[PDB]
Coordinates of C-alpha atoms and ligand atoms in Angstrom, one line a residue:
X19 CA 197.8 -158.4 35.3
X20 CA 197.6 -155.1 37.0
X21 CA 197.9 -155.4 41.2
X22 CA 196.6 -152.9 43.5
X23 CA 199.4 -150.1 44.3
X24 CA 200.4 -150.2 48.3
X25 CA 199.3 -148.0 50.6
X26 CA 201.0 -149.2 53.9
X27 CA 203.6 -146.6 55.4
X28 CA 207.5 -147.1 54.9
X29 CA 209.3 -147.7 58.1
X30 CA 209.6 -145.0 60.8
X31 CA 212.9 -146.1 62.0
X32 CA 215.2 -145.9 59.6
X33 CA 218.7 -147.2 60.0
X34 CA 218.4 -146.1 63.7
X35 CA 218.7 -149.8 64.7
X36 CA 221.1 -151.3 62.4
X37 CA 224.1 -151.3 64.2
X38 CA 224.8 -151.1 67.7
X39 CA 228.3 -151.3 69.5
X40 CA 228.0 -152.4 72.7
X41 CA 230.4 -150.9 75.5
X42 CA 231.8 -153.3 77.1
X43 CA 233.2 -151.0 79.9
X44 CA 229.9 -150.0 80.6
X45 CA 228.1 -153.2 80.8
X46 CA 230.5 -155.0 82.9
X47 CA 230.5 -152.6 85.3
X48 CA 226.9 -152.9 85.5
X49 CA 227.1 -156.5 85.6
X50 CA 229.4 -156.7 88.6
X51 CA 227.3 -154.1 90.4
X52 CA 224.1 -155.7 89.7
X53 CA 225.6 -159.2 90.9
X54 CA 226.2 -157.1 94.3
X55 CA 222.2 -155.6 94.3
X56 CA 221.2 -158.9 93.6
X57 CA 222.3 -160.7 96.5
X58 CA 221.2 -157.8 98.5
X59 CA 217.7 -158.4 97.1
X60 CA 218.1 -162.2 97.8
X61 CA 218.8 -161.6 101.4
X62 CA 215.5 -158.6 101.7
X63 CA 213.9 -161.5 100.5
X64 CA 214.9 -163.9 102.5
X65 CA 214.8 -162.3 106.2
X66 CA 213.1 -163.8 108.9
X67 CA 210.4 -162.1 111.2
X68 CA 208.5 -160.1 108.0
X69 CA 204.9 -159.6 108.4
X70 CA 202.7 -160.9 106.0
X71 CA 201.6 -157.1 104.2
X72 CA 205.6 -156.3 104.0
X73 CA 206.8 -159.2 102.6
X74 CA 203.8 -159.3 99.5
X75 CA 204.5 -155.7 99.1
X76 CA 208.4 -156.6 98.5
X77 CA 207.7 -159.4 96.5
X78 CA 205.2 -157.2 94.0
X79 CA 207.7 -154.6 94.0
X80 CA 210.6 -156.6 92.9
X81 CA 208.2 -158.1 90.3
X82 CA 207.3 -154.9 89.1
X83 CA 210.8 -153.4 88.8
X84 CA 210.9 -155.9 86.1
X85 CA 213.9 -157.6 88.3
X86 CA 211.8 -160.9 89.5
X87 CA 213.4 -163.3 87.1
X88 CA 216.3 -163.4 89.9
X89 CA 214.7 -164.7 92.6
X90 CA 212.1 -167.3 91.0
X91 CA 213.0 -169.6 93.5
X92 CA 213.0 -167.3 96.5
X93 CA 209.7 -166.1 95.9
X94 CA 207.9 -169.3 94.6
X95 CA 209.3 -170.6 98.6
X96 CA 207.6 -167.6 100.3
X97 CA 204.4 -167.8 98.1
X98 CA 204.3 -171.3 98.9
X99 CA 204.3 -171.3 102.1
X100 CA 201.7 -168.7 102.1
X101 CA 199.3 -170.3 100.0
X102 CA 199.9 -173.5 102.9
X103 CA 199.8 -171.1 105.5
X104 CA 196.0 -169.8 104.4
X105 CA 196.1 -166.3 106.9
X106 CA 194.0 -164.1 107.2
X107 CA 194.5 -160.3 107.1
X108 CA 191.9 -158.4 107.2
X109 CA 192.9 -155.4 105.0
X110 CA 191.1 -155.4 102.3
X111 CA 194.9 -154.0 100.5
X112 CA 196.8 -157.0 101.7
X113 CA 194.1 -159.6 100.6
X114 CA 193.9 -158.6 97.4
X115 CA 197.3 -158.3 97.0
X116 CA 197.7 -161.8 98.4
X117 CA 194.9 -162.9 96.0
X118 CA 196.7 -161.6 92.6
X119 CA 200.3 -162.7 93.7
X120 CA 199.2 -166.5 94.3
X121 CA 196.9 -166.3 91.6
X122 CA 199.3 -165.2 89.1
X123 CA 201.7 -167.6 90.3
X124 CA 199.3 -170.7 89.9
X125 CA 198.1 -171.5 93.4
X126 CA 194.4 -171.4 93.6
X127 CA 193.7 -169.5 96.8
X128 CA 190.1 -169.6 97.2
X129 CA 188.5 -166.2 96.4
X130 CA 186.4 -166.2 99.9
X131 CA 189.0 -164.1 101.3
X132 CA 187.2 -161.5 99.7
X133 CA 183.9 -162.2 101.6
X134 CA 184.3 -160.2 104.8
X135 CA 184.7 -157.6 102.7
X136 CA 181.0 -157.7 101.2
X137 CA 177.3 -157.3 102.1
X138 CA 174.5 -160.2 102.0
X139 CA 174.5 -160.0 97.9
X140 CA 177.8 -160.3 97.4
X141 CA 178.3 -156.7 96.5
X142 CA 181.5 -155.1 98.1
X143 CA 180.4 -153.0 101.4
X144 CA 180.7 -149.2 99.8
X145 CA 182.4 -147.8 102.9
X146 CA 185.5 -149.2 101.6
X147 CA 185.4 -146.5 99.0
X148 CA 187.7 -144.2 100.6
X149 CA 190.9 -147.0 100.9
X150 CA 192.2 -145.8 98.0
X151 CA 195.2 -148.6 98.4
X152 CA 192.3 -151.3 99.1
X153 CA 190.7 -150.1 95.8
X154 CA 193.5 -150.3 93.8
X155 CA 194.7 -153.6 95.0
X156 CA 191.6 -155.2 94.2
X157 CA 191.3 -153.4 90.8
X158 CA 194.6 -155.8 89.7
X159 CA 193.2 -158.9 91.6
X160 CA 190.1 -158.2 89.5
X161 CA 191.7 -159.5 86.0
X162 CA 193.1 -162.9 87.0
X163 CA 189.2 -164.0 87.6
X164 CA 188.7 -167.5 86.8
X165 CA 185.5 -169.0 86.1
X166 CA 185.0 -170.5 89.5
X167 CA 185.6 -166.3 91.2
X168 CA 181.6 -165.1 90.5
X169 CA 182.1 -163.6 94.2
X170 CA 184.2 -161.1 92.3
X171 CA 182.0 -160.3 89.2
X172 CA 181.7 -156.9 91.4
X173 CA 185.4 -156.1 91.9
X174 CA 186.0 -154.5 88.4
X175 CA 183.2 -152.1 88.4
X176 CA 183.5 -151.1 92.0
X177 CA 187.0 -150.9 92.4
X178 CA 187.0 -148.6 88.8
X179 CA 184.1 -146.2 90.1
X180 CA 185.3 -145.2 93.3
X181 CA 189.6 -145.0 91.5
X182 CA 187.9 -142.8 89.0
X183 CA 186.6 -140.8 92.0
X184 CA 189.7 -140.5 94.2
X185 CA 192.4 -139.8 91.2
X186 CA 192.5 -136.0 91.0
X187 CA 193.3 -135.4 94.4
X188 CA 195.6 -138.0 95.2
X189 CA 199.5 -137.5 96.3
X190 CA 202.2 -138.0 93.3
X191 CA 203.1 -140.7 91.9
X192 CA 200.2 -142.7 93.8
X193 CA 197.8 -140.4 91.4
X194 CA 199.6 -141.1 88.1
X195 CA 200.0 -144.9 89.3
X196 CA 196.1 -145.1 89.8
X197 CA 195.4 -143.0 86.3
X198 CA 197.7 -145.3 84.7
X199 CA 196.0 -148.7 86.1
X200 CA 193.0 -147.5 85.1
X201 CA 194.1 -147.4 81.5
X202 CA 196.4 -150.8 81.2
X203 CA 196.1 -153.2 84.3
X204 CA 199.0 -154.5 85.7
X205 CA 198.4 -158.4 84.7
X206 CA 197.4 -158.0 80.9
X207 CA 199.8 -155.5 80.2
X208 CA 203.5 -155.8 78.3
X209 CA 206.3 -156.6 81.3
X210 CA 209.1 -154.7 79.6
X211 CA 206.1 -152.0 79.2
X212 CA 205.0 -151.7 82.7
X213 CA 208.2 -152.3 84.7
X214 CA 209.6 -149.6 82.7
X215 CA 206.8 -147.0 83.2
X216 CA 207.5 -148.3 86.8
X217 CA 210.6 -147.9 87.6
X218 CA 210.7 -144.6 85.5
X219 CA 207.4 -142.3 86.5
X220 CA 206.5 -144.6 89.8
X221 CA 209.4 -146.3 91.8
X222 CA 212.0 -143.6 91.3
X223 CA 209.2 -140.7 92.6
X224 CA 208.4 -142.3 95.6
X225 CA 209.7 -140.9 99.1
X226 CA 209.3 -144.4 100.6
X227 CA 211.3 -146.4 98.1
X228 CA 214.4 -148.8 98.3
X229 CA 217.2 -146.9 97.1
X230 CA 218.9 -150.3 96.5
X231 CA 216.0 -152.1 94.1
X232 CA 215.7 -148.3 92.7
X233 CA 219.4 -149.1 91.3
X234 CA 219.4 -152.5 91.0
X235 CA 215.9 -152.3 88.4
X236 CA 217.8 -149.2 86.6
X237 CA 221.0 -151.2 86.0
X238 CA 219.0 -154.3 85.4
X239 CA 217.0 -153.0 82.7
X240 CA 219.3 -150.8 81.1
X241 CA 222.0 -153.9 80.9
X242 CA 219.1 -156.0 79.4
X243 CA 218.2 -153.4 76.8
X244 CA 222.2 -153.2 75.7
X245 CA 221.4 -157.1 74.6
X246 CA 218.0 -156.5 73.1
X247 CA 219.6 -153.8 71.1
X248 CA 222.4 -156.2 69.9
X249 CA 219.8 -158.6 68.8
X250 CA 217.4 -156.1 67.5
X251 CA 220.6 -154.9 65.1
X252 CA 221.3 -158.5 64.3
X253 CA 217.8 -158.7 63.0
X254 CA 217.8 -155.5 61.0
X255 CA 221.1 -156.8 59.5
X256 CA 219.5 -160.5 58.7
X257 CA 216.4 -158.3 57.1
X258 CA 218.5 -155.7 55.0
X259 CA 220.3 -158.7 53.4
X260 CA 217.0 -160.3 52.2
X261 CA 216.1 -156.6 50.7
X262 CA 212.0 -157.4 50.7
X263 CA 211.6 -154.0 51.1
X264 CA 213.2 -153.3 47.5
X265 CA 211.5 -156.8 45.8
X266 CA 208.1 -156.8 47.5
X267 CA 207.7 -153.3 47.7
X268 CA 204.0 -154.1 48.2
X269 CA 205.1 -155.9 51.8
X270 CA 204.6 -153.8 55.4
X271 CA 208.2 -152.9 56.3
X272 CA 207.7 -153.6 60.5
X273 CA 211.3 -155.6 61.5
X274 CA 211.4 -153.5 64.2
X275 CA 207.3 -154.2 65.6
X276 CA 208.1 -157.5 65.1
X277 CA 210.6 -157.7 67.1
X278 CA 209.3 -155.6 69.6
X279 CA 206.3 -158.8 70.2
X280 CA 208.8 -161.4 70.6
X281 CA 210.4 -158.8 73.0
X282 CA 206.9 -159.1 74.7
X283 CA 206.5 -163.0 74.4
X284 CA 209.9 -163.0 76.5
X285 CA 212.7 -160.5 77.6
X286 CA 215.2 -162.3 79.7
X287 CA 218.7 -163.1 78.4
X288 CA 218.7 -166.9 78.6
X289 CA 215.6 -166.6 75.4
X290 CA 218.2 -164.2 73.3
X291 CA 218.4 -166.9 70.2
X292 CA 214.5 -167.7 71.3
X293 CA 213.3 -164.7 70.6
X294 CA 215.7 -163.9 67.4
X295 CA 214.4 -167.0 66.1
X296 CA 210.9 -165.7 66.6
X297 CA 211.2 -162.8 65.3
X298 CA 212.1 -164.0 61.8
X299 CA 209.0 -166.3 61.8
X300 CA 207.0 -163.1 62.4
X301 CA 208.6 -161.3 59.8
X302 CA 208.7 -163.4 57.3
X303 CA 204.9 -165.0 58.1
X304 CA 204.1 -161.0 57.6
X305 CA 205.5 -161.3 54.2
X306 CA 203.2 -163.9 53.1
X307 CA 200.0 -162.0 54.9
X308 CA 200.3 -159.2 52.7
X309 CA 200.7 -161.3 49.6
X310 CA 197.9 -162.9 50.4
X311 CA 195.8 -159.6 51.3
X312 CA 197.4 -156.8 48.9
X313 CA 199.2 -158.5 46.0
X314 CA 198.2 -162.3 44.5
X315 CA 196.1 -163.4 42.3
X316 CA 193.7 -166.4 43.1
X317 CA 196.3 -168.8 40.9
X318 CA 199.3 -167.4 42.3
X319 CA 198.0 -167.7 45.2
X320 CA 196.9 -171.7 45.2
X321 CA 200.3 -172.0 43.3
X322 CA 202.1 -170.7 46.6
X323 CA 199.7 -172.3 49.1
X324 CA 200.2 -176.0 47.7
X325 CA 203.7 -175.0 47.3
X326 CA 203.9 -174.6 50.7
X327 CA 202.3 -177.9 51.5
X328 CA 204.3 -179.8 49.4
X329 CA 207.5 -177.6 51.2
X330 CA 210.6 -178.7 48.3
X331 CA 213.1 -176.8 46.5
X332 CA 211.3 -178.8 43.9
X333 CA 208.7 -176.6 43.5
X334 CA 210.3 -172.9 43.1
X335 CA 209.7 -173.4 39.7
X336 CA 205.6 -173.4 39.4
X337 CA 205.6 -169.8 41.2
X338 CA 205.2 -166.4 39.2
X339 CA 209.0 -164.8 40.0
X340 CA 207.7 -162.4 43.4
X341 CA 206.6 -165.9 44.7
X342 CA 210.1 -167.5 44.4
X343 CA 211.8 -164.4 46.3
X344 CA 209.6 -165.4 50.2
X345 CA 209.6 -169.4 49.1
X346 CA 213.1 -169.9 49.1
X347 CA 212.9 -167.2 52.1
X348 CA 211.3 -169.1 53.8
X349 CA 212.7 -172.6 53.0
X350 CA 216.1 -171.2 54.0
X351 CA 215.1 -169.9 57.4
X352 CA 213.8 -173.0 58.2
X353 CA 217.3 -175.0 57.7
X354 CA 218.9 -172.2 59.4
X355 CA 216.9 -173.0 62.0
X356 CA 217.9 -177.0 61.8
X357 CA 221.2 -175.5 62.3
X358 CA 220.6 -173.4 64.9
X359 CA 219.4 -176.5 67.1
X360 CA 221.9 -178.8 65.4
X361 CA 224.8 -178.8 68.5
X362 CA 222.2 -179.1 71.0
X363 CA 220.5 -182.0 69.2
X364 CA 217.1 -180.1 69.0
X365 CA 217.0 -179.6 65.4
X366 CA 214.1 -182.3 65.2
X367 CA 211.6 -180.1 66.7
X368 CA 211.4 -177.7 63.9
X369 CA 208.9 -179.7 62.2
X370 CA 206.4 -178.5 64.2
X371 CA 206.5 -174.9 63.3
X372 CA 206.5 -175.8 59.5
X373 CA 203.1 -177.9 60.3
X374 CA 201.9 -174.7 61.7
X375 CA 203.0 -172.7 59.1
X376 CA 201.6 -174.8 56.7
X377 CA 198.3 -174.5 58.8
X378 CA 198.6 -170.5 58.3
X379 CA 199.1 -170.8 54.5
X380 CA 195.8 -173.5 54.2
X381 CA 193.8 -171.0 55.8
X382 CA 194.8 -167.9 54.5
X383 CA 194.0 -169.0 51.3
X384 CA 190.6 -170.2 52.1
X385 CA 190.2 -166.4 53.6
X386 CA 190.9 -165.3 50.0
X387 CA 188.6 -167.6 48.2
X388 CA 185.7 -166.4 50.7
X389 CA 186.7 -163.0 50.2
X390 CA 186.5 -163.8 46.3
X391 CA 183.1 -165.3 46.4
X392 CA 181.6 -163.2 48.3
X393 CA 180.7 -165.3 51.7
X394 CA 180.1 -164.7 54.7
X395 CA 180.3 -167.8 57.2
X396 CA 178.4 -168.6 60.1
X397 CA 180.3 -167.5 63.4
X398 CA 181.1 -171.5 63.8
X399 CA 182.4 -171.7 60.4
X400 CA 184.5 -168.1 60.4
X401 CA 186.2 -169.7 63.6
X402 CA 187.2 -172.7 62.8
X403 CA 189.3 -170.7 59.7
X404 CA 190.0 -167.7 61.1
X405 CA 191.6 -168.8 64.5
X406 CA 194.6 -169.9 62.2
X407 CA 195.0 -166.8 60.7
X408 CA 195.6 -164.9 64.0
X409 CA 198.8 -167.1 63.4
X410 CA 198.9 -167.5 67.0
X411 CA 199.4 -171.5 67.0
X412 CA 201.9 -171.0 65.0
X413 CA 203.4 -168.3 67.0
X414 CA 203.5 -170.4 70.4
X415 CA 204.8 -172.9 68.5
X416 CA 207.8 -170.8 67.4
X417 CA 208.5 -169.4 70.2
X418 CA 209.4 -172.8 71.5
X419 CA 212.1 -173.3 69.1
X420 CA 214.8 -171.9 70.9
X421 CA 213.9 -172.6 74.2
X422 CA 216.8 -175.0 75.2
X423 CA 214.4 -177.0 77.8
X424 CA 211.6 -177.7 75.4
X425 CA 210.9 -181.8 74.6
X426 CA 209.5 -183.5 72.4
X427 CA 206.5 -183.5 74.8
X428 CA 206.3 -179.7 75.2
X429 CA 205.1 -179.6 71.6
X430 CA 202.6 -182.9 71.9
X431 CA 200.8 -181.3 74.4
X432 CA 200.9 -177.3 72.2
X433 CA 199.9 -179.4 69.0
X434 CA 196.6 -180.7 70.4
X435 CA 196.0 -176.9 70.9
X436 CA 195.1 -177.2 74.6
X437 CA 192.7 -174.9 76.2
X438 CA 195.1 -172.3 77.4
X439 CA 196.4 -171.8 73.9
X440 CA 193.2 -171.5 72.5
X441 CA 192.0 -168.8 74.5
X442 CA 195.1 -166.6 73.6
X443 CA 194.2 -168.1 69.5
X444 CA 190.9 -166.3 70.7
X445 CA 191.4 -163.0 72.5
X446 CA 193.9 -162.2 69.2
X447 CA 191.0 -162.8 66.8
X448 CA 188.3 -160.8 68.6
X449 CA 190.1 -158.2 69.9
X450 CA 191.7 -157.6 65.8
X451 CA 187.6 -158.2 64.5
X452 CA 186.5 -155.5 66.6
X453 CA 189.0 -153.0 65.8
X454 CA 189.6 -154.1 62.0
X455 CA 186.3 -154.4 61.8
X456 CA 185.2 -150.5 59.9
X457 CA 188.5 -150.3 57.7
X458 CA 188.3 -153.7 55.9
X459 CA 184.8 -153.8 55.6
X460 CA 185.3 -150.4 53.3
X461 CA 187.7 -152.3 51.0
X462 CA 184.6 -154.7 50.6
X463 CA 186.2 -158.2 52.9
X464 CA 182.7 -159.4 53.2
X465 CA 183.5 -162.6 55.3
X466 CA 184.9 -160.1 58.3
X467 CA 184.2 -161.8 62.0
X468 CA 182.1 -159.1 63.4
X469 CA 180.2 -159.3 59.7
X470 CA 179.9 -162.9 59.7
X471 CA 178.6 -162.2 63.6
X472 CA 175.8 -159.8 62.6
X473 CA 174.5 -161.9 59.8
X474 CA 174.2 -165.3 61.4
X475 CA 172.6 -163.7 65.4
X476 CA 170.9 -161.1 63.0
X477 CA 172.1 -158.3 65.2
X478 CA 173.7 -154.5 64.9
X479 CA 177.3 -153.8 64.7
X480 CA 177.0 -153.2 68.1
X481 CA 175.7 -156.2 69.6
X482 CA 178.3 -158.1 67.2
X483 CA 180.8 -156.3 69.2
X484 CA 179.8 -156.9 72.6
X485 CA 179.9 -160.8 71.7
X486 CA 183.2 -160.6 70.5
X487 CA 184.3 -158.8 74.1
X488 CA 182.3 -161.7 75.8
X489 CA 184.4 -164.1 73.7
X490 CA 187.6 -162.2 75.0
X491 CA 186.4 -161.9 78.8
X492 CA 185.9 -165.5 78.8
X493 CA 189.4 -166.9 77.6
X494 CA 190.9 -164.7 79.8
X495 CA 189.5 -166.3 82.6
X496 CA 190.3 -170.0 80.8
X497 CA 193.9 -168.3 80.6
X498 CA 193.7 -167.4 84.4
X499 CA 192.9 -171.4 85.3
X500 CA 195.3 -172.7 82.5
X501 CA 198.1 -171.6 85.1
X502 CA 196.6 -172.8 87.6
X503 CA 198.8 -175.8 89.5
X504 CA 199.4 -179.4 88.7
X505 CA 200.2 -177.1 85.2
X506 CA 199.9 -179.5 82.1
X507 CA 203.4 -178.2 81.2
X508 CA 205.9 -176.6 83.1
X509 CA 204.8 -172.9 83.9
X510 CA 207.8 -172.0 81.5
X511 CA 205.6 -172.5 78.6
X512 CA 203.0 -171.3 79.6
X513 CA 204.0 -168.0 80.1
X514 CA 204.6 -167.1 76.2
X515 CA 200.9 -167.8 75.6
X516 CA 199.9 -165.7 78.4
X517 CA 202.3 -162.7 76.6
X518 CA 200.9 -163.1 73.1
X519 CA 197.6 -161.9 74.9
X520 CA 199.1 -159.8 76.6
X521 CA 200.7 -158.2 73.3
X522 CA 197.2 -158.2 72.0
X523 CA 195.8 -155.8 74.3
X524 CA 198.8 -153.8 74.6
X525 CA 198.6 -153.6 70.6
X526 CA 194.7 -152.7 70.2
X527 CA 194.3 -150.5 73.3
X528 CA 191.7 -148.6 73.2
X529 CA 191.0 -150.2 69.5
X530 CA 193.1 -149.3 66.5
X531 CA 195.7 -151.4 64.5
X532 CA 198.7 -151.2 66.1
X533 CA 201.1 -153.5 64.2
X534 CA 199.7 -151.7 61.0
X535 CA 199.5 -148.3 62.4
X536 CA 202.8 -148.2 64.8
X537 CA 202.9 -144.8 65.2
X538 CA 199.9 -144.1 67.5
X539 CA 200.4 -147.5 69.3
X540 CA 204.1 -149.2 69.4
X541 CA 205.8 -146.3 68.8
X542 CA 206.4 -144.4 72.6
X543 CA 206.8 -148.2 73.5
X544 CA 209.8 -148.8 71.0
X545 CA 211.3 -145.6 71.7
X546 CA 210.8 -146.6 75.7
X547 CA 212.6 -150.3 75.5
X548 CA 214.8 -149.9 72.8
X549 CA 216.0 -146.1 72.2
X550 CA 215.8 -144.2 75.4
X551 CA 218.2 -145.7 78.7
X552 CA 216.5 -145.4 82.3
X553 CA 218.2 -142.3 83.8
X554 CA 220.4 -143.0 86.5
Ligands
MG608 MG1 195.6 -160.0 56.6
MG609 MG1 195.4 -162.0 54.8
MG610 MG1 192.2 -158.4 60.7

């Protein structure tokens, strides 16, 4: 049986990654500085007598100097109480500002702030061009619309015309801060990713700025990437030992994007065996996406697939010998994970990734069999398989795993896949349709989303398209009022669903394959996170 040879590029990285030797001189030193520069920041935070405009505009820094995750308490207080307080500035900078902070945050502050700043239509008053701050603060309160904020269905396109307008002539780095917003906004963007191009081209360039959150954010992120880059060698170690990329040559060799999205789904030390857990799973459910896609046969593949159902060292035996190599992969991942979770008594919650998994498989090798036959689904029908194969469910779920403070409950409420988590499911699958959409259709995958969109509306590639941005638009906004307060979760697990999203439009900006072509895309943001320190 002859396959089809592969065609997907061998790792850019190297060995670069494989070992890293932390020193230890170094990062305690940074350790017991930063401990200083933190309770500095605790008491800017906490000082009496601020006005209302100075003490968002700290808050928002420290949140984007990527150093927030100090002070949740602190700030959740002073938003609070700002949100119960219901002011009224009227700069059109500090009220969008105050908008997007309590927003983001989950308290739903009414969006008539925004009306004495807008005619009898509800169209922003025009001489409010020329506040270039104004402007750009509503541009970022513009993308954490709910359904229920139609009284700023203007803010996007008004805010964007008149930045567009004002950019070449602006003072440095305001200009390269408003050319950059522009491209990525602020609230769907990576955090690593933007507090880094923060504190780098933005923070440190600015005559006004804090010379003691300057240091703090540079120690701060530096010290974090010295752990990201232990784990990150960890990984490559755990992946060379497996040796796919010598067995199943025909499988993407991506360890490093990988973990590069569960660097994106959470960054903080206390989720470092989260987020080497997660990585695996998105490794290894790669493994069996290109097997799928580039390698089986129909047989071998419904061999694998009920294999997977039936989940037994029983069953190595019915698969051709390439299958055996990822099953028992995968089988032992899964008891390492048991392990893992053992001391803590958690190991019971690993079920609920292998459902998902399981869910992945089913539907992956439906996409096959429709790819084999030749048919193309309604939109309903596409959906209700291809949703699965973003393998975004199982993704959430996963990332759960390690997170020391998830119940039994946590994962009731993620496995009736609640509105929040479907939105996310969504944005990944439209956003990867539209950009996917030319390149597989030339290898001939005739039951493609945007396909299966122009044949059942009976509209152009186009129109297809502009439905599948309509799709995305909308879960955002279902996103936006999934964190709104009472939460149905803690806001804790709701923020990794938000960051898969997040890693969708950081992956397909602008519209190519970015986990499949990591050089245009992933690539400046690897080399920012993980290679290059933050000068000091
Ligand atoms: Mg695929
Ligand atoms: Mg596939
Ligand atoms: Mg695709």
């Amino acid at each position: 049986i002859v396959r089809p040879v592969a065609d997907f590029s061998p790792s850019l990285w190297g060995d670069q990654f494989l070992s890293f030797s932390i020193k230890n001189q170094v990062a305690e030193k940074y350790a017991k500085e930063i401990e200083a520069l933190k309770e500095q920041t605790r008491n800017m935070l906490l000082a009496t007598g601020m006005k209302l405009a100075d003490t968002l505009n700290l808050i928002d820094t420290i949140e984007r100097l990527g150093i927030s995750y100090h002070f949740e308490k602190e700030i959740d207080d002073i938003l609070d109480q700002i949100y119960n307080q219901n002011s009224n500035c009227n700069d059109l900078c500090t009220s969008a500002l105050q908008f997007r902070l309590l927003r983001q945050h989950g308290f739903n502050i009414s969006p008539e702030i925004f009306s004495k700043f807008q005619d009898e239509n509800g169209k922003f008053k025009e001489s409010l061009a020329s506040d270039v701050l104004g402007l750009l603060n509503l541009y970022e309160a513009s993308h954490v619309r709910t359904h229920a904020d139609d009284i700023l269905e203007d803010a996007l396109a008004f805010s964007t015309i008149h930045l567009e307008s004002a950019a070449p002539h602006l003072k440095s780095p305001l200009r390269e801060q408003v050319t950059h917003a522009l491209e990525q906004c602020l609230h769907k963007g990576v955090p690593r990713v933007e507090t880094r191009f923060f504190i780098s081209s933005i923070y440190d360039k600015e005559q006004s700025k804090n010379n003691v959150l300057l240091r703090f954010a540079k120690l701060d992120f530096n010290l974090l990437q010295m752990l990201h880059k232990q784990e990150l060698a960890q990984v490559s170690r755990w992946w060379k030992d497996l040796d796919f990329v010598t067995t199943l040559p025909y499988a993407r060799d991506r360890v490093v994007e990988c973990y590069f999205e569960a660097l994106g789904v959470y960054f903080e030390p206390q989720y470092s065996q989260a987020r080497v857990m997660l990585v695996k799973t998105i490794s290894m459910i790669s493994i069996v996406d290109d097997t799928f896609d580039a390698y089986g046969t129909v047989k071998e593949l419904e061999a694998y697939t009920d294999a997977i159902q039936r989940w037994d060292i029983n069953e190595i035996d019915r698969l051709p010998d390439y299958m055996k190599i990822s099953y028992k992969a995968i089988l032992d991942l899964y008891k390492d994970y048991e392990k893992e979770l053992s001391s803590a008594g958690r190991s019971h919650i690993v079920c609920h990734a292998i459902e998902r998994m399981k869910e992945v498989v089913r539907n992956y090798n439906v996409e096959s069999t429709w790819f084999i036959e030749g048919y193309t689904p309604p939109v309903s029908e596409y959906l209700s398989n291809a949703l699965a194969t973003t393998t975004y469910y199982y993704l959430a779920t996963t990332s759960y795993l390690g997170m020391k403070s998830a119940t039994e409950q946590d994962f009731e409420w993620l496995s009736k896949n609640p509105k929040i988590l479907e939105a996310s499911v969504i944005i990944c699958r439209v956003i990867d349709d539209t950009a996917t959409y030319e390149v597989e259709k030339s290898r001939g995958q005739i039951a493609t989303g945007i396909e299966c969109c122009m044949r059942d509306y009976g509209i152009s590639t186009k129109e297809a398209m502009a439905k599948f941005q309509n799709m995305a638009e909308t879960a955002w906004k279902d996103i936006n009022e999934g964190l709104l307060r009472p939460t149905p979760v803690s806001t804790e697990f709701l923020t990794p669903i938000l960051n898969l999203a997040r890693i969708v439009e950081v992956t397909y900006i602008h519209n190519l394959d970015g986990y499949t072509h990591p050089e245009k895309v992933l690539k400046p943001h690897i080399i920012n996170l993980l290679v290059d320190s933050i000068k000091i």
